[PDB]
């Protein structure tokens, strides 16, 4: 009855309300009945007598608590619910919900959103915090944000909550904490213009079993490979559900044409006698890709007359000369050299190019410094497809929407990402917390490591 | 040492009571065991040595010799007093042009030989960068080097630091 007339609602400061972390009591560690104190942000367990929230309320004179699961506010030590609409942004920062009208109009958001502190931001164009060595995963998670259908899947918890898990399955923590992070990143009424990905990364550390730590940085291509495969594994309900959202968004079908070269150290009569052996003929081992791996030609070891930078440079179509049915790539394993041709059959709606920068030579890992000269608003991938296929694929023109760039040495490297904000046409370089507005002409000048493209 | 150990183990139990110090203790099974277990291990060593008997850092030098051998096998054998010195000078010239960040394109050189020299220069480049950084961690850590290793290292690191600095300037441009 003293709901709607609580005195202690001025005592709330949203400057300390960090709802990004583990909802455990800060005394008893318990996830059961955790309550945020809205005066200091610290979580405490229980709303009854001799609980930690009650004893905290009388210990600190902090008399207003929010149930972290029920989203109901409470005055302790004396107890009653608080029903105030001015506290709704606290629950919306704690648990962002997205209606279907809010998801459909989510990419048509030209006006800036304001945080609770005076910091304007755009939803999704939101900095991810850097714990020690993390920017590979911040870059990949900001790349899978701003992919609209994967985002729209992970913005409704109902899209993935009811799907079946094995009993001792830790791998679904990736799915639910990725959804939590996606709802925090696209939150239009946040309390700060940045989101700590720390719970998402503890899910990454636990699920990859200390592959992709936070203290030691990994490669973004390895993390994106594992993370798309692990989201696709965990969004299958106690089975390989063959089509998840990750397959529906990123996966295409290529047609690899492996051809065994006979052996190089043979005479010519035996070398063309081995052609009819049909072990040295073409195969078709047609498979599915999450991402296309683009191999740069190596740094040319010498500068050359023509352009005078030491920085080498390839067009995008020359490293997309792989994945047409003409260009053959040498594969070399022990005793056997193959001539793999590639052929794109199903082009995904959102195509990832993982441009291979780091190769290990005989002595160390060298980063290819070659700059891919790509357009950002039109690549007609029509001619990288069979004519058996180009009648099915009506739209094959892709626009770049995300560009993860690795900067520096392979050892002391950093990751930034140019994301295209939809609704505007503006591009933003997010290096982990700072959000620069980058120009559309300056994306193609950086070392493109991972790229995500949208089929229109 | 072990047999002496067992002697100290045995004697100091043997020489108790009315038994004093002296040469009369022989409980030889412990040491005899130890020497037989040694014989177990060196039996196939001495057997392999008798079967063999009673029968019937410088990767640039090795790499340069190997690539010279790989061109010198595939020559027309009419010409090896003529071209084997010139392609060695081409190897060393391509390496000098890599160390200088200057273009090396010989127009009259045939592109398989050019591609093998390019390959040699890339292998020596990776070894050279790695041995410059390794010798620098050796020198900086405090490991004992002489004058020519430091002088050589400083030249390698000067060319590497100026390759990185030229890449830094071109990244600024």
């Amino acid at each position: 009855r003293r709901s709607r007339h609580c005195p202690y609602l001025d005592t709330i400061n949203r400057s300390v309300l960090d709802f990004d972390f583990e909802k455990l009591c800060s005394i008893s560690l318990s996830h059961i009945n955790a309550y945020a104190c809205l005066v200091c942000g610290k979580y405490f367990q229980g709303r009854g007598l001799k609980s930690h929230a009650y004893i905290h309320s009388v210990q600190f004179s902090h008399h207003v608590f929010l149930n972290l699961h029920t989203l109901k506010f409470y005055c302790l030590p004396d107890n009653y619910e608080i029903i105030d609409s001015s506290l709704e942004d606290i629950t919306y920062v704690l648990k962002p919900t997205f209606t279907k009208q809010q998801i459909a109009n989510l990419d048509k958001q030209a006006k800036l959103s304001r945080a609770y502190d005076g910091t304007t931001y755009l939803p999704g164009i939101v900095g991810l915090n850097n714990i020690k060595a993390n920017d590979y995963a911040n870059a990949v998670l900001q790349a899978l944000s701003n992919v609209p259908p994967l985002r729209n899947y992970f913005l409704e918890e109902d899209n993935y909550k009811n799907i079946k898990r094995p009993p001792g399955d830790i791998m679904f923590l990736l799915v639910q904490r990725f959804g939590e992070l996606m709802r925090k990143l696209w939150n239009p009424r946040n309390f700060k213009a940045h989101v700590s990905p720390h719970e998402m990364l503890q899910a990454v550390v636990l699920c990859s079993k200390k592959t992709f730590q936070i203290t030691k940085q990994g490669d973004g291509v390895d993390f994106l490979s594992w993370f798309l495969n692990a989201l696709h594994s965990a969004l299958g309900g106690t089975k390989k559900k063959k089509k998840t959202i990750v397959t529906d968004v990123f996966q295409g079908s290529m047609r690899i044409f492996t051809k065994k070269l006979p052996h190089p150290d043979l005479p010519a009569e035996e070398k063309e006698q081995l052609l009819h052996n049909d072990e040295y003929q073409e195969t078709m081992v047609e498979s599915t890709f999450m991402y296309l791996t683009l191999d740069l030609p190596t740094a040319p070891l010498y500068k050359d007359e023509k352009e005078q930078l030491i920085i080498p440079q390839v067009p995008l179509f020359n490293i997309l000369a792989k994945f047409n049915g003409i260009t053959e790539k040498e594969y070399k394993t022990y005793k056997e050299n193959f001539l793999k041709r590639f052929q794109l059959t199903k082009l995904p709606p959102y195509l990832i190019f993982c441009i291979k920068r780091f190769t290990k030579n005989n002595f160390f890992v060298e980063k290819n410094p070659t700059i891919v000269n790509f357009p950002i608003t039109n690549v007609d991938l029509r001619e990288y497809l069979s004519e058996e296929v180009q009648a099915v694929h009506k739209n094959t023109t892709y626009d770049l929407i995300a560009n993860i760039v690795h900067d520096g040495k392979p050892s002391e490297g950093s990751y930034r990402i140019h994301v295209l904000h939809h609704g505007t046409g503006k591009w933003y370089e997010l290096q982990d917390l700072q959000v620069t507005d980058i120009l559309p002409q300056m994306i193609t000048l950086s070392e493109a490591y991972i790229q995500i493209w949208k089929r229109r | 040492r072990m047999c002496k150990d067992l002697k100290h183990l045995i004697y100091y139990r043997f020489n108790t009571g009315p038994v004093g110090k002296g040469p009369g203790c022989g409980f030889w099974a412990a040491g005899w065991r130890v020497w037989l277990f040694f014989m177990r291990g060196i039996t196939p060593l001495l057997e392999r040595w008798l079967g063999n008997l009673l029968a019937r850092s410088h990767f640039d030098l090795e790499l340069r010799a190997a690539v010279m051998h790989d061109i010198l096998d595939m020559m027309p054998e009419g010409i090896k007093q003529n071209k084997a010195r010139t392609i060695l000078q081409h190897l060393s010239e391509a390496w000098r042009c890599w160390k200088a960040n200057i273009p090396w394109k010989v127009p009259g050189l045939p592109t398989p030989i050019e591609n093998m020299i390019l390959r040699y220069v890339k292998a020596k480049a990776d070894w050279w960068t790695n041995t410059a950084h390794y010798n620098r961690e050796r020198i900086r850590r405090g490991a004992t080097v002489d004058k020519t290793v430091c002088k050589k290292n400083l030249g390698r690191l000067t060319r590497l630091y100026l390759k990185a600095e030229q890449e830094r300037q071109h990244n600024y441009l």
């Binding site: - | 061109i71 045939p110 398989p112």
Partner: peptide, 30 residues
């Protein structure tokens, strides 16, 4: 690998070149 086991591909493609291009190899005096 060993060194010539890395250079074997280039040695076999070096077998391709003709003898008209062997004595026309310049020296480094230029």
């Amino acid at each position: 690998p060993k060194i010539q086991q890395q250079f074997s591909d280039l040695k076999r493609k070096l077998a391709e070149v003709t003898e008209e291009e062997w004595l026309s190899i310049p020296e480094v005096g230029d």
